[PDB]
Amino acid sequence: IEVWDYEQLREEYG
Amino acid sequence: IEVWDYEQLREEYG
Amino acid sequence: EWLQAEIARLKGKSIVPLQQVKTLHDWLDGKRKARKSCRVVGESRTGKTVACDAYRYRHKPQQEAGRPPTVPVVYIRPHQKCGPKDLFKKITEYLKYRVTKGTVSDFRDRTIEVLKGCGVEMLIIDEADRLKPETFADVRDIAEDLGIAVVLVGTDRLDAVIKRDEQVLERFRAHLRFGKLSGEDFKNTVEMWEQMVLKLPVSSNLKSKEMLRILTSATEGYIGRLDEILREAAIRSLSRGLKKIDKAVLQEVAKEY
Amino acid sequence: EWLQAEIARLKGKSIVPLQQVKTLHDWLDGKRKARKSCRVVGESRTGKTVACDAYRYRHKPQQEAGRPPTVPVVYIRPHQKCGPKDLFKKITEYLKYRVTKGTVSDFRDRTIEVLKGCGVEMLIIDEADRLKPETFADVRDIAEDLGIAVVLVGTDRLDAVIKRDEQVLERFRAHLRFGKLSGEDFKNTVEMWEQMVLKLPVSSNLKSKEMLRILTSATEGYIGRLDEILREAAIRSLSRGLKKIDKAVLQEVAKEY
Amino acid sequence: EWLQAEIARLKGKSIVPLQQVKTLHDWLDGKRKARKSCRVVGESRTGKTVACDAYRYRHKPQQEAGRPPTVPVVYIRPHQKCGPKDLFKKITEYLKYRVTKGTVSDFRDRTIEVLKGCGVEMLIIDEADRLKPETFADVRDIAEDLGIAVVLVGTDRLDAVIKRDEQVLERFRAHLRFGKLSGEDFKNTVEMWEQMVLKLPVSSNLKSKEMLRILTSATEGYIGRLDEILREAAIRSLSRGLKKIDKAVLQEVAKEY
Amino acid sequence: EWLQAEIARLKGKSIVPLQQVKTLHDWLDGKRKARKSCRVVGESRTGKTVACDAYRYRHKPQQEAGRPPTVPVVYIRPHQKCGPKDLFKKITEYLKYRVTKGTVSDFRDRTIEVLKGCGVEMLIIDEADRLKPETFADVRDIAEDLGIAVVLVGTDRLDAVIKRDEQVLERFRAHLRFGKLSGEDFKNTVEMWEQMVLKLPVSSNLKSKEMLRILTSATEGYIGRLDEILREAAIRSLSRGLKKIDKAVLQEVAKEY
Amino acid sequence: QRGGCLQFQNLMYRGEYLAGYAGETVNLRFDPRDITTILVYRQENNQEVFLTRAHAQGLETEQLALDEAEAASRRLRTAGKTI
Ligand SMILES: Nc1ncnc2c1ncn2[C@@H]1O[C@H](COP(=O)(O)OP(=O)(O)OP(=O)(O)O)[C@@H](O)[C@H]1O
Ligand SMILES: Nc1ncnc2c1ncn2[C@@H]1O[C@H](COP(=O)(O)OP(=O)(O)OP(=O)(O)O)[C@@H](O)[C@H]1O
Ligand SMILES: Nc1ncnc2c1ncn2[C@@H]1O[C@H](COP(=O)(O)OP(=O)(O)OP(=O)(O)O)[C@@H](O)[C@H]1O
Ligand SMILES: Nc1ncnc2c1ncn2[C@@H]1O[C@H](COP(=O)(O)OP(=O)(O)OP(=O)(O)O)[C@@H](O)[C@H]1O
Ligand SMILES: [Mg+2]
Ligand SMILES: [Mg+2]
Ligand SMILES: [Mg+2]
């Protein structure tokens, strides 16, 4: 399963 | 072993 | 240098898919389509905020060339003793409209315009109990007048505040509750941390009975403590040069808590 | 001196053909044939004056035989607390006519006469909120009496001024929004700046993950900061005899902000 | 005047490397590197503030030419019934900015800016229980949002105050307890004052059994009484001309307690 | 009378090179070549105005016959509550252009012409918080329309004034801070002052540990207090007949503070 | 009280739902042989109903009869120490 770096979701969000 | 004067610590501070 | 990359990685943060996060997202998606206001409650280390951020990062602001962004989900966090003008200020800034000087009715009318113009479907309010009691009038207003699912997020304190007013309690009765990990669910989650988050080069076999007597006692089932305890034990182990955690070093970390 | 040539170049200015600029010109071309008044809004570092100036450098004055110059687009920036006289003085002077000792109701009539004579199709009023509230009656009179599209350009305060008067809000109800850079659009733009603007002999390859973290933090999506920062890093670097911008010199610049 | 020089010296203060202080600094470096918030507790004369000043006066502010100071550790002490503004006022002044008149949110925004600008790693709050209950919302916020280890220092009443808010209690859970001296440790410490602090012209042999009974019953093991009893006995005995402390003169000082 | 010659020397100002001053001169020379506006901040007795005076004089006018004199650096002090007319009045006067009665847009037009004519690179405003809020619009106009670096200089109150307007905050986002004297730097600076400014007929030897304790408590690190305390103590010393500063008069001067 | 606390025989108790009821009055039901855990009941529609079990913070693994807690409290008040 995938686990998301919280700063990568912060970078990829609009 | 070293001991400190409270006021020397104040004088040496930023 | 090998060590210093791992020490930087371990001090960072990540979102792990877990059942409690998956269970929230499939409930919030239902409330977004049905336009129903509701509340997420639970204890102060269960990871509610990471679950709500993980949801904000699913529905990203869609863009059309010359228009305000289409923003399906808004998430805000109020400051302490938040007044009506402070709530409206933040909703307006989040949608990327700069906030000029004015009175509370100017801020209200502008917030109501931008919530319509950006096509908002859900408004998630974290730490809802920082709101001053009167502001709830403006929160109920947004939710009855606009088609917006207001979600209030908070600890048991929130309900103690809410029960002071029938008018609010009744808009926000539907709730999902976050709990603590136990039994097989705590045991399975420790293995997910070992493989997916710690990534230590020798396996620490943290699912063993002697390691789980430490972790279950120290973490009390909170995901907040589990992430903090294990990252500290991994930083401390690698900076001492061991390629995996051991019974005495995890005992040294757990003794502080 | 070869080095003295490059610092004189980087200190200056240039226009990059960004999607947002293309999006404005395509929108204003609909408005110019339709003759509809409108407004452009957005944050102060998003590119608005430069995007409007590029539209003025398209559609430059015609001069057929035995006619006045035909001037399809007029662009002006008022002075602060601009009165009814000062607006007419700017429109007259942009059209190259000299003006002599009028009372305000002479300046009005001479402005209407040159706006007719030059065949003006559009009037772009930059920093529109420098206008005193009473001058909008002269802006509405230009827009209704003549076949002119007025474009008000400004920040979120402009809206606050317009919303104070129904007469104006309605003539200028339609609008386009300028917004900040994000995601793959920020990355593509940094790559374009490197090859298009900086032109150092060796590649700096700033689209590299490690370098985009410095720029994203340093610039927060504003096209303004991005340009200043990349220029200042090329100037400083060149003064010290380096062939490229590198990680350390770029952090040295960004810390000042 | 040799007497008056010793009376001017002895009424002064010093910091001694003791085990309790060396222990705290090893622990606070752990919390600062790991960015984890925590609390230090223990009875009122154990010397917790001297142990924290010995930390603040190590880790000196770093100066870079014309930049604001880089300040790794901040120690503040609040006034009674400290409100949100008073906390923000003091953090701003400690980093050397003058605080200008504003609303609570102006102080909040400026404080967040100077904490992030001065690169603060740890914030130490002495006498934490002077904080008004609402201010902990702003302390939790500083610690959630910025990478800052907040350390609360207090005594056993602080726990009685922390336990009235679940949000504070479950964050400030890690802790170190300052304890009293006994056995060999009290015995060994008395020799350190005789040879490193008092500077009397002949040995007073304070660690002898006939003298340790006097000092044990006087001090109860508190380092803050040991320094007080032994300075007062030195001041007094020099004003009578002896080169020592002896059984009867020490029993005169101890009979005041 | 030899004594009178020396009393007249001490009452007059002079400039002593110091690290802080050098730091600014180099920073401002980066900004001037890059034509980037910025601001300088710091407490009111750090000697900011004086550093700018020292800077101006290095770069006084250059000229040829018939060609109006080129003036790279313009410096002004605005009076209290400075309006758009009074700012332009001062810039016109510093450039030594003769001036006559007119409307504000006549002063504006004249000011823009003389700034362009004299080839100005940099415009330095002292006490910049004194400006009325509507003048910063003319200052942004100077900066955007002309190749000029505007350097706002002031105290922490300057930033509180700037953050009230996004349009200004962004042009002037970069900054440098003037700090206080401490540690070895205060000590070396006191020694320089004795050799370079006081020059009394017998060395006072101020670096002595008991003298610096007097100067430190009396001045708290401000260069503007240091120079003032020492001049009054040297004038007092000479008028009491001493051939150097002594402890007995230096304490008396400090007792007034 | 605020934060869901109850005070009883100088011991302070907290429990799984109490914070939502702050300012209400609840009927504590307790065993004098061991007061480290208390049952909390509340009145709804004039019908008493069970709310939660409340546990004396920081001594959940101990035991205390009410007589031990009362006698120790007198010694603390006589000694002049805090409780
Ligand atoms: N699913 C998850 N994956 C990774 N880390 C998690 C997860 N859930 C929680 N955490 C971690 O747990 C810690 C606290 O979680 P979080 O900040 O979500 O708490 P919370 O329940 O919102 O707290 P509070 O009620 O005080 O606001 C953080 O370090 C966070 O990264
Ligand atoms: N498309 C572009 N190409 C090149 N430079 C650009 C572009 N857009 C903006 N810039 C640069 O960014 C800076 C600010 O841009 P600009 O002056 O257009 O801002 P603006 O949005 O008109 O300002 P404001 O909204 O405050 O009036 C300038 O240095 C300008 O040259
Ligand atoms: N490490 C030490 N070295 C030398 N003297 C010490 C040391 N610790 C304490 N003392 C002496 O004993 C006193 C103890 O007071 P201190 O402020 O250190 O206690 P505290 O624990 O901060 O008290 P409180 O909790 O009541 O504020 C000091 O003022 C000093 O005179
Ligand atoms: N470079 C210097 N060399 C010698 N003396 C100096 C220097 N700078 C400052 N001083 C001394 O300290 C005083 C403070 O300098 P100055 O008057 O420039 O203060 P300032 O920081 O500009 O004041 P404010 O912020 O209140 O406007 C001077 O009047 C002078 O006596
Ligand atoms: Mg512009
Ligand atoms: Mg203390
Ligand atoms: Mg000055």
Tab-separated table of C-alpha atoms in Angstrom, chain D residues 11 43-45 77 79-81 86 127 130 155 157 222 225 228 232 235 256-257, chain F residues 27 31 33-36 108 134 137 140-141 144-145 166-167 170-171 173-175:
chain	number	residue	atom	x	y	z
D	11	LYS	CA	19.401	44.581	-14.255
D	43	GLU	CA	-2.949	40.106	-6.297
D	44	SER	CA	-0.290	42.773	-6.735
D	45	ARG	CA	2.589	40.548	-7.846
D	77	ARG	CA	-2.292	54.620	-14.629
D	79	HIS	CA	-1.983	59.274	-9.776
D	80	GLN	CA	-3.184	58.777	-6.172
D	81	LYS	CA	-6.515	60.547	-5.311
D	86	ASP	CA	-6.293	64.682	-13.942
D	127	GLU	CA	-4.613	50.969	-10.503
D	130	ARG	CA	-6.531	55.537	-7.270
D	155	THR	CA	-6.364	44.476	-6.487
D	157	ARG	CA	-9.560	46.674	-2.834
D	222	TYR	CA	4.390	35.028	-7.200
D	225	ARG	CA	9.500	37.152	-6.630
D	228	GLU	CA	13.766	38.996	-8.804
D	232	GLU	CA	19.730	38.621	-8.188
D	235	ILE	CA	24.069	39.057	-10.848
D	256	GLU	CA	17.017	38.591	2.563
D	257	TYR	CA	13.207	38.219	1.993
F	27	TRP	CA	24.735	45.830	1.249
F	31	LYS	CA	21.129	47.030	-3.996
F	33	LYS	CA	23.768	48.064	-8.876
F	34	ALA	CA	20.696	45.715	-8.891
F	35	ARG	CA	18.217	48.728	-8.632
F	36	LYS	CA	16.234	46.800	-5.938
F	108	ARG	CA	4.970	65.703	-8.965
F	134	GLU	CA	-1.142	58.249	0.790
F	137	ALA	CA	1.795	55.534	-3.621
F	140	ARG	CA	6.037	53.191	-5.472
F	141	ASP	CA	5.571	55.316	-8.622
F	144	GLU	CA	8.487	51.481	-10.710
F	145	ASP	CA	8.615	54.218	-13.371
F	166	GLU	CA	-0.038	44.786	0.631
F	167	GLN	CA	1.000	46.949	-2.247
F	170	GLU	CA	5.777	43.581	-1.535
F	171	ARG	CA	7.898	46.174	-3.236
F	173	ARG	CA	10.030	43.089	1.293
F	174	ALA	CA	13.828	42.691	1.563
F	175	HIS	CA	15.593	44.206	4.591
